[PDB]
Each structure stands twice: as structure tokens, then as C-alpha cells.
Design a protein around this ligand. Sequence first.
Ligand SMILES: NS(=O)(=O)c1c(F)c(F)c(S(=O)(=O)CCO)c(N[C@H](c2ccccc2)[C@@H](O)c2ccccc2)c1F
Ligand SMILES: [Zn+2]
Length: 258
Amino acid sequence: SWGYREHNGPIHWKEFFPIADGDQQSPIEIKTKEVKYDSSLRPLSIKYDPSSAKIISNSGHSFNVDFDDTENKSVLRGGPLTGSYRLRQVHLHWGSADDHGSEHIVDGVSYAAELHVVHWNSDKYPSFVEAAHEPDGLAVLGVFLQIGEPNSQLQKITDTLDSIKEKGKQTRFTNFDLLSLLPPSWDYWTYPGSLTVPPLLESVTWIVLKQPINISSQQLAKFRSLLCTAEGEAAAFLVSNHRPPQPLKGRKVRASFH
Ligand SMILES: NS(=O)(=O)c1c(F)c(F)c(S(=O)(=O)CCO)c(N[C@H](c2ccccc2)[C@@H](O)c2ccccc2)c1F
Ligand SMILES: [Zn+2]
């Protein structure tokens, strides 16, 4: 089964998921000299209902906070998007060191970690599973994290981690103020790409926010204490879960700002 260890990590994924070498894979290096400003891009419009959050689980690959997705209470519109994209879940990527944990990189620079907020096109498709197999199906908001003052919604997450240490565990999680994990500037970059985990489907419109938010070193370290293994298996720790940047293959990265 896939993971981030030496014999099941990113370089091996193509052995089971051939789309790993596809032409629209993520993450990428954003090269600001090649980024094109586009005045047709719209500002992001976001609304996340804190009571939309239901549970947090350990997938063995990250934590996932899952949201009720039967209504348009928590939705993302505008940006590069056509129509309404319904919030499905949030999760985080990090690395074994505090200065090299993000998925996307900007002009050579890695951030400490990278938060992804996953949405699906509910104006066109009947569920997230269906949306995940279409080019305009999903939209993921990426927010970088840098070492700084602790965020209280990140503490709300890290307080749960002891209860979800083993893969498959979950616990109630609601009244989650997700909008608190967005930076005050919503300037962004956007490009067409993929899930960064197997099955690596090329269905994602990426929207990567330029400004980072802050996490403490203590908060960040608590994520590395999650296991990628299940209860009563030999313990292995999720000390890193970021995929390297993938070939751009000519894709256009657009900026909302200049
Ligand atoms: N970095 S990314 O934004 O591209 C990303 C991740 F990094 C990520 F860790 C997940 S995950 O849900 O946290 C565990 C691996 O599936 C999903 N979520 C979906 C999922 C949830 C539960 C079980 C399987 C899959 C996603 O993996 C998915 C959903 C439906 C169809 C294909 C894939 C995801 F989209
Ligand atoms: Zn992700």
C-alpha cells in the first residue's frame, strides 16, 4: 500500500498509478517570472459555516477534517472557477524538518507545511467521487504555513491528535473556524493539476494563496506523532507526507495580482 516511506513513496507510485507520470500532475514549483497576471481572474468568494465540520480522522496519510456536503452552506466561488464548489475536507502536508514541508514551492523556497481545502463541483456532478474524475470537478485551495505565532484553529486540531494516533481512528470535530486559517490577503496563483496523492486524478483546479499563515514549531511537531499504521501493527510514524514538485509540461500558472 502506498505511502511516503522508502519502498512505497512518491518515486514508486507510478508502479501502481501510471497517471503519476501524466501531463497535469501536482504539486509544482511556482516560478514567478513565468507567472502570467490575468485580469479575467475573479477574486475568491468564500463562505465556510463552522458547524459544517463533522469529524477528524487519521487516514494514515494525513489528518482529514470532513464536512457535511449536502447543502451550499460552505462553498468556494469566483477565482478561476465556473459555478459553485462545495467544501468536502481539509488536510495538511509537512516534512521531517521545519523548513522543508510544503508541496508547492515558490522560486526555490519551501514553506514549513501546506494546508489543503478540497472542494467539488456540485453544480455539475452528483458527488465528490464523480467530480474527482472530471477535469473541472475539484478545486483545492492551498495555504502555506511558516513557523510563527500559534493559530488557535490549528491548536483545535493538534489537541485531537492523541485521540487519532493510529490509522483509521476518528473523533467528533465541529465548530471549526476554517476561515481563520486563511491569511488576510487572498491574492493567489492558479493552474490546472491533480490530486497529490494516489489516485493522482487530473481533476483539480489549484488555487495557491501567496501569503502564509503561522504555526508554531510545537504545533507542527505534533503532526509527525501520527502513525501511518493501524492499531496493533508495528508502529511507523508519519514524519513527512509531501510529494515533490512535478514537471510543469508547459502549463500556465496565472496570478490574480500584479
Ligand atoms: N493533496 S490532495 O488535495 O490532492 C488530497 C490529499 F493529500 C489527501 F491526503 C486526501 S486524504 O483523504 O486526506 C487521504 C488519502 O486519500 C485527499 N482526499 C480524497 C479521499 C478521501 C478519503 C478516501 C479516499 C480519498 C481523495 O483522496 C479522493 C476522493 C475521491 C476519489 C479519489 C480520491 C486529497 F484530495
Ligand atoms: Zn493535499
